[PDB]
Ligand binder design. Structure first.
Ligand SMILES: [Zn+2]
Lengths: 170, 1112, 8, 169, 111, 52, 105, 220
DNA sequence: TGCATCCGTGAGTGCAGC
DNA sequence: TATAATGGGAGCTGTCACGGATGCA
């Protein structure tokens, strides 16, 4: 039962909460980093306040803030006001948020996914088509079947090799 | 050609300026033309007056403000990605009370966005529109309690972000309760705070027996205004120390403080009219001579009790009534955000006032303009009401500016939205168009301002009517709100008139929306026009009265989506509104005064007026709009031409000689054709492409930056590694593609090289390059290339560099290069066509001319529309339009057929008779009699009862022609269509939905960071989403491997997708799937939640999906 | 409920 | 206060730059250029220094930043992963290795092995001449010579079959 | 072995520490000038693994066939960078803190 | 602009004296029905025969 | 089949002193009817040189041997004082409808 | 306009096994109908040989009963939709299955949608999937403990084979949502809805997902 | 013990979206 | 590193129905 209390708060692998340089050289990062930073700041300040023999009101405040920090990290907005970034009303996205909802991990990335070898376009009536057939635009097909097309281009004299065929279709 | 117009109704007044709702609003808000001392207490001046004076002893006060000239013109702002704006200076003075020292200075507060002439804004180079909001007007309302009948709720509502809603309710326990910030407390307490003696409340509320007894509490009257105040403070603020001055502060701020609590001027007026009182200020109470004095509360309580009792002259309120719903226009919204930013600036001011040195403080040192700037910028950028302007065609802009939204800040959310407000209230008549709204989730929430509709100074929509005295209809026009309109009996606009007098024994009118037949003695007012009932868009649909509303909606909405055509034409059948739209939209260029044309050029028109002055008008030429449609003006005049005032100098986009041109007039036959028109699909003639009908110019903008990095600078150059001269063929010396070159997907628009990170050149690659004698370079090819499915002619290049005059970029950027590419788009298969009646379809087939159905004279039809689209849709306007269109084809004329005052069947029949003579008698004179095929078709039609037996072939052909039907020959056979077919001219537009924009395909491409799933969207070269429901489809089919591929091989299984690609290029069958990466992401994200998720075997032994990489 | 209030 | 931590003296410099620019804009009726800020900052400060100082001062943006008026679009959804090799890149490296091994069986065992050692195909490190020479039991001059002839034969065969050309981009 | 069942259960502090490849002692992310990860920070390569394949932070060992090896100078294991999406870190709290899922979820399991 | 192409091959499939199928490809656009309809009209109306 | 105009890089451009834009000029030139006498002749480049003020018609094209314009009154351009137009228009024999996109001449 | 709103409403109500506000009053037992109506108040009694029961309803309610009639247990006394749970306690599971199926089908038929009873039956079957223990017997279960009918039946067959006392249980009807959240597989439930709840209960229980259904296998 | 009542949780899909 | 300074500040209002708890009469 006591495992429902956290002595040691786990830390997600960094690649799952990236710090990434976007196209323009500017940085973009996950909120989980800010949550973790709140957590670590408050924890460290707690250890320093303890080691320095601080009065009870201070330590109490610090502990309360630490619990609320952990709350914000795991489920944000679950208890109390949701933690937001400075100069924004936007709630930070916590692990619970990541998991659940329509935008959550399960529904978005698990029960459904974006896929390769796919395309889309406008539809037009097929009256000359047989029931088992559909008209498929040439270029769409060239892209969708592309690896097969490279292979078949190599099977003939159309290209020396796969890479040559691809550079040719570029 | 001749324009013949129908209808007997003479419109007394023209349409008001259609962009006035934006223009006058913002002008009123800024007061830039008004000298400072003459300014009113409304607008940004109001915000200044509310914020200042700033006290707490230093005092910062506000004298006046001023707006300077814009540092840059609108065009230059569009090109440089700037904001059209004026510098805002404010004259302030710091006064130290004790010292008496006064330091006065004019401080620079930054800039404010200026509205353009057409009622739009330029923000960071892009044109935006602030959309008017609709909301519940502030005031005092009385609504039925949904739970307990016989009891009512009295709600006191201020302006948004102006302080709390206050509810008053009679509780089942008999005592009156007040709700503020979700706190229920006895009202009598606050009544005591206002200093009400039990005797006064008794004599005031005594008329209602049962209720006032429930109002009586002696424990409250045993107190004092101070004690009661502190009691209330303890009730609203648990744990907060009940200091006297703090309680006074809180209650004042909650009720009497004008800066914290504001009913609108409209809220003031409505409260006054409803409660039958007079308000001093805009608050619910005052602080006067040390104590509080009541304003709204007692009258509200009195009215509530009176309504509860059943006392006459007391009714509940219809909150959907357009007397109770007002509009917040650009000026009010912008002013609101201005007020907020100003408040923040004030907070900063008090800060500096406390902290700064007491000997020397200037207003400049006290004021940080930044928060205000931020508030304004935020409003004009990230607000939901600040929208990317729709410039697709001029009507799109004009319509966008006239939009009304129930959404946005202080508005509804689509979840809270429910029927009662998406409904169409009777009071929408003449105010909000019943027709034009989105079909989907926003239906009824996003609406359109009616043509004659106007928003008053209080924010209520008013519609014009005409005074009728003694059955005589005056030319006096009166604009009323819905509340005012409810007081009268208003006759319909089509009531028969001889002179100015109504002649009918019985007239059709409205009384509070209710249709009623009255005698002329009873008519107080009369409508200006049927036009006033609908929007500007809906007013463009001829024969509207013949179209079901549902399709009128579609025609309306779709006209917005019409693409400007190079050959664009005005409709053969117009509504009469086509010119005003062009004029008000500022699309066309017009002559300022009477004069003579000096010079005519593609780029310029120079006019000499009566003043003798030479005025030169530059023409906008092939400019790109927000939607990429080409906006260009062409001269419609010639050298030496005399022009009177308001004459057309030049046609803008979608304008033919000053008439709105949204499409082409094409010759249609309404018949099925070989399944190619099946289910709304449309068949067109290649003849349309031959003569460049439905061809439109589109311009796309590409952009690249070369910036300073830590690995060395990116640079824009013609020197690109591993690239032939064939690829650099069209690149100039600097590396930018040259104007006039043709670009196709894969072509380089701008050459760019970037230094390689540690990409520790794969000692694999070291070997490779050493073998091949070619040394491994340090830079790589980052050049901007034409995306798949795009291309055209390069019409422009813009190059901005650091170190160049007048040019400073964002930090780290060495240079920016833009390339504008134009493309001429012919109509093609899959392009969307539509008429004004809601008939939409995608072009499914383009036949050569010889395959087209044709008239006996050898004339092929342009378009074949399926008749199956008519009956279920019930839009017959297009049929009539076709019939008349036929007449005007042979008579060579165009028509104006006003909505609800129209062309009628008999008139169209006359025109069709004349037209028939033109179409036939010519043949008879040419020495040709009736054709055998015509005889057969006549026999057929005679069996159908279309023509009368015994008449000559000519007589019968005329009989058919009067029905809008003609004999038609199959181009493929030569045998006639067995029945006579409806053929005529129809106005059809090419919509902004074009298959060229929508066609996308991907094998592999970029993947997301965390999920490692394909990116979405064409622009990102993304994969299609296979969602939960698609998965359900595959499950239902029991196709497990197709599904598993979707979930693994084709999306987030790294090893799987790689091995699959390699397998396919090799010719091997695809390898077995592995764990999708996002499941690992799930496991690790659950671990971060301190939950241990373990994949196990049937032995219940752990299985490692991270393959030892996650375990120490 | 409100941490600031509690601390104050 | 910063997700990317900055030293206190540098934060002081940045804030000073801010206040300077704000005063300058307060007297200029517009945002100042880099040059004007550089002037107001004093000696040691040029436009480039102001620009780079403003560059390093830039704070990161949220990946969860909303896009569109709905709740269904994150800013991070538009950001591709440049790290993990694409299926095309992986397959290309695979065909490259397979083709190089072709030419491996080509050159003799010794010269192919010398090349694989010197270029780092074996342990991943690039051996010196003395190491491959002590390994094959010859002089460094000799091992250098057989490396040379190996590379030379590879060059001839490559000119002949044009097989490894397309991998050079 | 083939995956058959999937179990989910509470994680002990001991388990959580067993997961962790290091404790994150500092709020720092990456250095402002270098744009490299900071020691004992949220992005530290010492804890969560190498940013580059088979290459440590200081660059003492750049090659495969140096697997599982840990640099003495920079403390970074040479291995596949993929592990940066796998290996957990941890934060040791001074005061124990309740997991809000087992508190705020009614009826409260702890309660 | 430049257009030069080969004459079509005439293909014949015949079962007895009762029935036959006749294939002509490739033809320029539209010429399928340009040849087909007149022939069908002629074949039905104008072919010499006998009757009671 | 083709049009060259001096100081005009593409179809999307305008010319000083000329009322019609190039798109319109080409639209007018697309109505041009050119008769060839000699059956052996495949192509002709019609040269036009003009300046304003004048209204340039199809008749203004410099005559070529065995070439007759069947519509000399066909409007081409409207030229203004200072307005100068210099064109070379390639006219070919052919059949059916071949779009600019296809022939790329 | 001129001459499936309600439709969708009612269906959802039925598939969620919701107690209607339109609720019809039904007899808990058999008996004979004795109507007693004062002008002010109205009531209907159902009288068996052993004992009688009283139903007090608003005087404006439409009665489906004639005075002195013999009514089956669960038979509607008044008009309106029946509470499926009341019908369950009264007339048993088969009655409820028939009621839900026919009721749902009414709506679809009304709109001219031909749809086979089978599908609705599948869903209803999933709705009846659970039971509530009335007495534990010799088992480890508890009074009021909800579990799968298959599980309690297997348990009771093991107990009967062992010679022990069987578990006394009552049929339980739950709507589609609760039934989906109450399923054995935690991946399915947690990915459905109420993720934190499902996950905490599973984690405390140390739940093992056997990957029986489609959702789980899709997720993996 | 039955019935208010308050709190928490849900509310279609794919396009694009700056 | 020293005049004295001692309890915050922004609220957000037009859903809607259900399951399940909790409390009070
Ligand atoms: Zn190292």
């Amino acid at each position: 039962p006591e495992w429902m209390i956290l002595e040691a708060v786990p830390v997600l692998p960094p690649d799952l909460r990236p710090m990434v340089q976007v196209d323009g050289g500017r940085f973009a990062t996950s909120d989980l980093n800010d949550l973790y930073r709140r957590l670590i700041n408050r924890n460290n300040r707690l250890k320093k306040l303890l080691a320095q023999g601080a009065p009870e009101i201070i330590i109490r405040n610090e502990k309360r803030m630490l619990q609320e920090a952990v709350d914000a990290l795991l489920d944000n907005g679950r208890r109390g006001a949701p933690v937001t970034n400075p100069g924004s009303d936007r709630p930070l996205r916590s692990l619970t948020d990541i998991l659940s909802g329509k935008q959550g991990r399960f529904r978005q990335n698990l029960l459904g996914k974006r896929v390769d070898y796919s395309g889309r376009s406008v539809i037009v009536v097929g009256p000359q088509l047989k029931l088992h057939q559909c008209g498929l635009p040439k270029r769409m097909a060239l892209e969708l079947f592309k690896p097969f097309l490279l292979k078949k281009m190599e099977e003939k004299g159309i290209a020396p090799n796969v890479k040559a065929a691809r550079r040719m279709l570029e | 050609m001749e324009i013949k117009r129908f209808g007997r109704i003479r419109e007394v007044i023209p349409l008001p300026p259609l962009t006035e709702i934006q223009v006058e609003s913002y002008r009123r808000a800024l007061q830039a033309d008004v000298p400072p001392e003459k300014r009113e207490n409304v607008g940004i001046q109001a915000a200044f007056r509310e914020t200042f004076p700033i006290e707490e002893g230093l005092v910062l006060d506000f004298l006046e403000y001023r707006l300077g000239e814009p540092p840059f013109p609108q065009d230059e702002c569009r090109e440089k990605d700037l904001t059209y704006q004026a510098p805002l200076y404010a004259r302030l003075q710091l006064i130290h009370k004790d010292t008496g020292l006064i330091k006065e200075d004019e401080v620079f507060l930054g800039h404010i966005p200026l509205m353009t002439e057409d009622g739009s804004f330029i923000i960071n180079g892009a044109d935006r529109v602030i959309v008017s909001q609709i909301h519940r007007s502030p005031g005092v309302y009385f609504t039925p309690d949904p739970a307990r009948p016989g009891r009512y709720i009295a709600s006191i509502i201020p302006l948004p972000k102006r302080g709390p809603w206050i509810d008053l309710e009679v509780e089942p326990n008999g005592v009156v309760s007040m709700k503020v910030n979700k706190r229920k407390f006895p009202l009598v307490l606050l009544l005591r705070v206002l200093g009400y003696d039990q005797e006064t409340l008794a004599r005031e509320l005594g008329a209602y027996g049962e209720l006032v007894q429930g109002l009586m509490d002696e424990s409250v009257f045993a107190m004092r205004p101070e004690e009661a105040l502190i009691r209330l403070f303890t009730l609203l603020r648990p744990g907060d120390p009940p200091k006297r001055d703090k309680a006074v502060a809180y209650v004042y701020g909650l009720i009497a403080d004008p800066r914290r609590y504001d009913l609108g001027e409209a809220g003031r007026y409505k409260a006054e009219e409803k409660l039958g009182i007079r308000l001093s200020g805009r608050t619910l109470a005052r602080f006067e001579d040390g104590e509080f004095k009541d304003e709204v509360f007692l009258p509200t309580l009195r009215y509530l009790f009176a309504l509860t009792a059943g006392v006459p002259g007391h009714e509940v309120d219809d909150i959907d009534h357009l007397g109770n719903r007002r509009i917040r226009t650009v000026g009010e919204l912008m002013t609101d955000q201005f007020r907020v930013g100003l408040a923040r600036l004030a907070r900063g001011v008090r800060e500096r006032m406390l902290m700064g040195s007491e000997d020397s403080l200037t207003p400049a040192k006290l004021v940080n303009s930044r928060p205000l700037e931020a508030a304004i910028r935020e409003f004009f950028s990230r607000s939901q009401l600040s929208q990317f302007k729709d410039e697709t065609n001029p009507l799109s802009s004009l319509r966008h500016k006239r939009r009304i939204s129930a959404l946005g800040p202080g508005g509804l959310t689509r979840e809270r939205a429910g029927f009662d407000v998406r409904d169409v209230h009777r009071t929408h008549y003449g105010r909000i168009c019943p027709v034009e709204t989105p079909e989907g989730a926003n239906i009824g929430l996003i609406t359109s301002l009616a043509a004659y509709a106007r928003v008053d100074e209080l924010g209520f929509i008013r519609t014009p009517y005409r005074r009728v005295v003694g059955g005589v209809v005056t030319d006096e026009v009166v604009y009323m709100t819905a509340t005012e309109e409810d007081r009268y009996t208003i006759a319909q606009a089509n009531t028969p008139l001889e002179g100015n007098r109504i002649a009918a024994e019985r007239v059709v009118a409205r009384r509070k929306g209710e249709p009623v037949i009255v005698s002329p003695e009873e008519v107080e007012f009369m409508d200006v026009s049927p036009k006033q009932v609908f929007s500007v868009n809906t007013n463009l649909i001829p024969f509207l009265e013949h179209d079901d509303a549902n399709r009128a909606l579609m025609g309306s909405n779709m006209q917005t989506q019409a693409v400007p055509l190079i050959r664009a034409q005005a409709p053969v059948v117009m509504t009469g509104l086509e010119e005003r739209v062009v004029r008000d939209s500022l699309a066309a260029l017009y002559a300022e005064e009477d004069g003579e044309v000096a010079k005519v050029d593609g780029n310029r028109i120079v006019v000499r007026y009566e003043d003798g002055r030479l005025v030169e008008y530059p023409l906008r030429r092939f400019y790109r709009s927000n939607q990429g449609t080409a906006l260009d003006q062409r001269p419609r005049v010639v050298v030496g031409q005399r022009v009177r005032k308001g004459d057309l100098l030049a046609d803008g986009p979608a304008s033919e000689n000053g008439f709105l041109a949204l499409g082409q007039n094409v010759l249609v036959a309404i018949m099925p054709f070989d399944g190619y028109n099946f289910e709304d699909a449309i068949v067109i003639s290649e003849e349309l492409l031959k003569r460049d009908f439905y061809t439109s110019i589109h311009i796309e903008r590409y952009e690249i930056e070369a910036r300073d990095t830590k690995l060395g600078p990116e640079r824009i150059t013609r020197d690109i590694p591993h690239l032939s001269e064939a690829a650099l063929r069209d690149l100039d010396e600097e590396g930018v593609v040259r104007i006039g070159a043709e670009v196709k997907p894969g072509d380089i628009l701008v050459g760019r090289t970037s230094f390689k990170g540690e990409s520790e050149p794969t000692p694999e690659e070291r070997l490779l390059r050493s073998i091949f004698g070619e040394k491994a370079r340090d830079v790589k090819d980052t050049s901007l290339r034409v995306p798949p499915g795009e291309g055209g002619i390069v019409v422009r290049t813009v190059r901005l560099r650091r170190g160049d005059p007048g040019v400073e970029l964002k930090p780290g950027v060495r240079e920016v290069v833009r390339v504008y590419v134009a493309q001429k788009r012919k109509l093609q298969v899959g392009d969307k066509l539509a008429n004004r009646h809601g008939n939409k379809g995608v072009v499914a087939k383009i036949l050569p001319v010889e395959d087209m159905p044709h008239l006996p004279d050898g004339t092929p039809v342009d378009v074949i529309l399926n008749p199956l689209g008519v009956p279920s849709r019930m839009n017959l306007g297009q049929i009539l339009e076709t019939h008349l269109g036929l007449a005007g084809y042979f008579l060579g004329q165009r028509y104006i057929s006003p909505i609800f005052d129209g062309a009628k069947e008999p008139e169209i029949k006359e025109l069709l008779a004349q037209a028939f003579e033109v179409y036939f008698g010519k043949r008879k004179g040419e020495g040709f009699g009736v054709d055998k095929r015509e005889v057969e078709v006549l026999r057929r039609a005679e069996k159908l009862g279309l023509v009368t037996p015994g008449k000559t072939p000519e007589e019968q052909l005329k009989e058919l022609f009067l029905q809008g039907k003609v004999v038609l020959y199959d181009g493929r056979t030569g045998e006639p269509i067995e029945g006579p077919i409806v053929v005529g001219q129809m106005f059809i537009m090419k919509l902004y939905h074009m298959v060229e924009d929508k066609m996308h395909a991907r094998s592999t491409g970029p993947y997301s960071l965390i999920t490692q799933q394909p990116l979405g969207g064409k622009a990102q070269f993304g994969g299609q989403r296979f969602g939960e429901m698609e998965v359900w489809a595959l499950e239902a089919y029991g196709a497990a491997h197709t599904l598993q591929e979707m979930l693994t091989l084709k999306s987030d299984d790294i090893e799987g997708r790689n091995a699959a690609y390699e397998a396919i290029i090799k010719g091997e069958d695809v390898p077995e799937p592995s764990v999708p990466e996002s499941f690992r992401v799930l496991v690790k994200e659950l671990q971060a939640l301190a939950l241990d998720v373990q994949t196990l075997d049937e032995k219940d032994n752990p299985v490692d999906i991270f393959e030892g990489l996650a375990s120490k | 409920s409100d941490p600031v209030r509690q601390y104050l | 206060a910063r997700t990317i931590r900055i030293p206190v003296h540098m934060v002081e410099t940045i804030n000073k730059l801010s206040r300077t620019a704000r005063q300058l804009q307060q007297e200029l009726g517009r945002e100042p250029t880099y040059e004007e800020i550089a002037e107001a900052m004093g000696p040691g400060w040029d436009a480039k220094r102001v620009e780079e100082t403003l560059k390093i001062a830039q704070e990161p943006v949220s990946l969860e930043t909303p896009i569109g008026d709905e709740k269904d679009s994150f800013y991070g959804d538009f950001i591709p992963d440049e790290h993990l090799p694409s299926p095309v890149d992986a397959a290309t490296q695979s065909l490259l290795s397979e083709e190089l091994e072709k030419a491996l069986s080509k050159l003799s065992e010794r010269e192919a092995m010398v090349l694989k050692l010197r270029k780092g195909l074996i342990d991943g490190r690039e051996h010196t001449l003395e190491e491959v020479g002590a390994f094959f039991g010859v002089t460094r001059e000799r091992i250098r010579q057989i490396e040379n002839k190996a590379l030379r034969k590879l060059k001839y065969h490559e000119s002949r079959t044009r097989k490894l050309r397309d991998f050079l981009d | 072995k083939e995956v058959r069942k999937v179990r989910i259960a509470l994680a002990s502090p001991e388990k959580i520490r067993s997961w962790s490849y290091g404790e994150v002692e500092k709020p720092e992310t990456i250095n402002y000038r270098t744009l490299k990860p900071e020691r004992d920070g949220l992005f530290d390569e010492r804890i969560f693994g190498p940013i580059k394949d088979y290459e440590c932070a200081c660059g003492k060992y750049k090659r495969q066939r140096f697997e599982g090896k840990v640099c003495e100078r920079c403390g970074v294991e040479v291995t596949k960078s993929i592990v940066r999406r796998y290996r957990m870190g941890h934060i040791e709290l001074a005061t124990p803190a309740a997991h809000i899922w087992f508190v705020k979820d009614v009826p409260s399991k702890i309660g | 602009l430049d257009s030069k192409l080969k004459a079509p091959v005439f293909t014949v499939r015949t079962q007895g004296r009762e029935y036959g199928e006749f294939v002509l490809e490739p033809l320029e656009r539209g010429f399928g029905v340009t040849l087909g309809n007149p022939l069908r009209r002629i074949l039905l109306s104008s072919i010499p025969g006998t009757a009671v | 089949t083709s049009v060259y105009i001096e100081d005009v890089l593409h179809e999307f451009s305008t010319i000083p002193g000329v009322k019609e834009d190039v798109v319109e000029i080409i639209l007018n030139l697309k109505e041009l009817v050119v008769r060839f006498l000699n059956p052996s002749l495949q192509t002709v480049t019609l040269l036009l040189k003009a300046e304003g003020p004048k209204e340039v018609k199809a008749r203004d094209f410099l005559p070529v041997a065995d070439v007759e314009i069947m519509n000399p009154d066909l409007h081409i351009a409207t030229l203004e004082e200072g307005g100068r137009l210099n064109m070379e228009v390639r006219v070919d024999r052919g059949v059916g409808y071949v779009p600019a996109e296809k022939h790329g001449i | 306009t001129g001459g499936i709103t309600q439709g969708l409403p009612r269906v959802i109500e039925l598939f969620e096994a919701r107690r209607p506000k339109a609720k019809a009053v039904i007899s808990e037992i058999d008996g004979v109908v004795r109507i007693e109506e004062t002008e002010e108040k109205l009531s209907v009694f159902v009288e068996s040989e052993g004992f009688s029961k009283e139903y007090k309803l608003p005087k404006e309610a439409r009665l489906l009963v004639k005075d002195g009639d013999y009514v089956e247990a669960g038979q509607p006394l008044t008009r309106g939709a029946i509470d499926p749970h009341q019908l369950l306690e009264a007339k048993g599971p088969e009655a409820v299955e028939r009621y839900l199926v026919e009721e749902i089908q009414k709506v679809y038929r009304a709109q001219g949608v031909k749809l086979h009873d089978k599908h609705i039956e599948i869903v209803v079957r999933q709705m009846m999937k659970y039971v509530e223990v009335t007495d534990p017997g010799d088992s480890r279960l508890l009074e009021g403990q909800v579990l799968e009918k298959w599980d309690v039946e297997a348990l009771n067959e093991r107990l009967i084979a062992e010679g022990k006392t069987p578990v006394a249980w009552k049929p339980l009807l739950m709507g589609v949502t609760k039934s989906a959240l109450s399923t054995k597989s935690w991946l399915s439930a947690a990915s459905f809805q109420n993720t934190t709840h499902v996950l905490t209960e599973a984690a405390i229980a140390g739940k093992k997902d056997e990957l029986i259904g489609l959702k789980e296998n899709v997720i993996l």
